[PDB]
Symmetry: C4
């Protein structure tokens, strides 16, 4: 039902641009490293997969990053921004759903507080107006004693 259904196009934009990050960092990983590391970055497919392993922490004790870091000492300029942008995108997938849910609640409490105020007003006026008519009657009955 359309409160999460609204937020889906933004979810896709993040998901789409996330896959774009693997593609360009794989094309770029193949250039920079594949020469010296054919096993990991020698092909475009191998690059996609070693990047995917880096993100899923399956290179945490066998650590694909660290051997390449030791050979090229400046290669964090690629392994750091990749890990940052591709983690920040996956975060924006969960954030977008968190926002979508709490955005809906805020918008429902927005009415139930504005209808309460309209109700209290409609009833406070109705109380006053009845109190009026009753007084207008007793005034007429005061002006009949006078005739």
């Amino acid at each position: 039902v359309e409160s999460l259904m609204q937020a889906l196009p933004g979810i896709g934009w993040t998901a789409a641009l996330l896959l774009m990050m693997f593609y360009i960092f794989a094309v770029m990983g193949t250039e920079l490293f594949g020469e010296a590391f054919p096993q990991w970055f020698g092909s475009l497919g191998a690059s996609i997969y070693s990047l995917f392993q880096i993100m899923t922490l399956e290179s945490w004790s066998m650590g694909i990053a660290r051997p390449v870091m030791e050979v090229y000492p400046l290669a964090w300029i690629f392994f750091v921004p990749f890990i940052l942008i591709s983690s920040f995108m996956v975060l924006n997938l969960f954030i977008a759903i968190i926002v979508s849910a709490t955005q809906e609640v805020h918008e429902s409490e927005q009415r139930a507080e504005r209808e309460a105020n309209n109700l209290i007003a409609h009833d406070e006026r109705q109380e006053m107006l009845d109190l009026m008519r009753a007084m207008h009657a007793k005034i007429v009955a005061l002006e009949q004693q006078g005739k």
Copy 2:
């Protein structure tokens, strides 16, 4: 001027959708074109076999299955492609659905807020007339008193 508001988002989905065919074709050419020159041998052939997969013209002469049966792990590419590229086309229709119903909700938002302002304006006007009529009869009550 309620649908025209939603068009830039439509384009972002449409643009990123074509980006998916491009990268999955470049990637399809690498992974498979060696063993399947007919289907993935060129970048153009890859773009077209991917397009055939999406339009279900590979459902009995299914391009996916033979490649699946040579490389057993190739669903890691045919599955995410079919998912992302279907989810984008879905977001094209969703964006128009939202744009339409978003407008209706925003029109019912006034017609309910003007009704409330009207009922208030009229409930006060009813009270205020009933006041003046009372104030007159009170003055007429203080004139017998003189």
Copy 3:
């Protein structure tokens, strides 16, 4: 801060627009460069012939039509390119149109809600003064009575 609100969306359209020239140039080079080295032979030449197509400098010397005649099915590329890349440039102007009129609607939204709050505050103040004046005359009625 009303057109400043809309700039990130402007960039997304502008960014994805340049992405369209890139992928259609990489595709244009594949499909055609073999038979048309002058126009699509390099990635740069492809970018530029696509740019000429959009700016109507191939109206009478018409880069599209010779390639259309050689490959009869090549509209499947020249049509979607011209569509998406025109629709993106349209979304650049639409986004500014929306940004401007969105601001006006949001300013008229207050000046109508303050008018209503004003009329209420003054209609109550009129009633309430009319009350006190009556309450006084009634007390003066009840002093005749003592």
Copy 4:
């Protein structure tokens, strides 16, 4: 959770920004690398000379000028790159500026609407008390009369 709203848009700008370096590097390698292997000869070298151009470390040892000065028409690439990639970084700061001031406007939106509801509640309550006191003195004015 007010800056937390705005992060997905921040990423879209950041993501599309890196997309600009990628395509302009692939394109820079084509156009120039033949004549400038040191700067644009590889995809990595292109990405880095573009990054140097943006960070103004090419401002007395300016990579752009020599290439401008071999290919006279090469501003058609160095200008749009510098524009789009500066406009994206601007949209990173704009998005945070909007996110902050958007929150303040939405908090002042209540504190002004609760003040109005309060003043109404209290202006009615003042009127209503002044009513009851006046209904009482009228009853006492009709007991005089019995």
